[PDB]
Write a protein that binds this ligand. Structure first.
Ligand SMILES: Nc1ncnc2c1ncn2[C@@H]1O[C@H](COP(=O)(O)OP(=O)(O)CP(=O)(O)O)[C@@H](O)[C@H]1O
Length: 205
């Protein structure tokens, strides 16, 4: 049983979307996935109602739900947590019961300062350090800032995944329909997502 948590208070960094597709990716790899929607808006939960996610969804009404994750979904292979868009007791709660903490971040001109807040909490873990990665979400080939973000990431002392999720239309249209990119035909999207999943899987050795 391994708990993975996508955390980042600054809403708009692609938490949900990355979670939806990555969980869907892992499911196709034979892993019994379980996702926890810790966001008040219940975005991933309202989505899960549309169709039928390739994984199970749980809505963490409060912190109590997150803390118990290790005991509630202990039968699952992975417990992918969908962080909320605010620095609540949950933001830190996720870090505690997690084995890997992904930090979704999109290249913007003024908003990489919403992301370090998580990196600080990652330190609060003295023999109890939890693995962490930097996920580059919503990528556009505007060479310039992709580099600014890329560099400011190392100032944290946290390595970022080799691959990044580009800004494609399928990622938005997938949600509208009620499913993921794996239900479409955008091989370009499926590609990067899979290559990203394996990278996450390669972590647990
Ligand atoms: N790879 C991608 N390509 C195109 N649009 C994307 C995208 N990833 C995310 N988006 C869009 O960006 C917006 C914010 O993404 P998302 O809803 O994942 O953010 P969050 O704000 O991280 C979600 P939540 O807090 O619900 O977990 C949405 O409008 C979404 O459709």
């Amino acid at each position: 049983m391994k708990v993975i948590s996508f955390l980042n208070p600054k809403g708009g960094s692609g938490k949900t979307t990355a979670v939806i597709n990555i969980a869907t990716a892992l499911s196709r790899s034979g892993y019994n996935i379980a996702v926890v929607d810790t966001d008040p808006q219940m975005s991933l939960t309202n989505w899960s109602k549309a169709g039928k996610a390739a994984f199970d969804v749980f809505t963490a009404a409060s912190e109590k739900d997150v803390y118990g994750i290790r005991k509630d979904l202990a039968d699952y292979d992975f417990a992918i947590v969908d962080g909320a868009g605010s620095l609540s007791v949950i933001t830190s709660a996720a870090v505690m019961v997690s084995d890997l903490v992904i930090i979704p971040v999109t290249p913007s001109p003024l908003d990489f300062s919403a992301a370090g807040s998580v990196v600080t909490v990652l330190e609060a873990q003295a023999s109890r350090k939890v693995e962490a990665r930097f996920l580059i979400t919503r990528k556009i080939e505007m060479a310039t800032m992709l580099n600014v973000l890329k560099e400011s990431i190392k100032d944290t002392g946290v390595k970022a995944f080799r691959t990044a999720i580009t800004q494609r239309q399928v990622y938005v249209k997938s949600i509208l329909d009620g499913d993921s990119v794996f239900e479409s035909s955008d091989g370009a999207a499926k590609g990067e997502i899979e290559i990203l999943t394996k990278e996450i899987v390669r972590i647990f050795e």
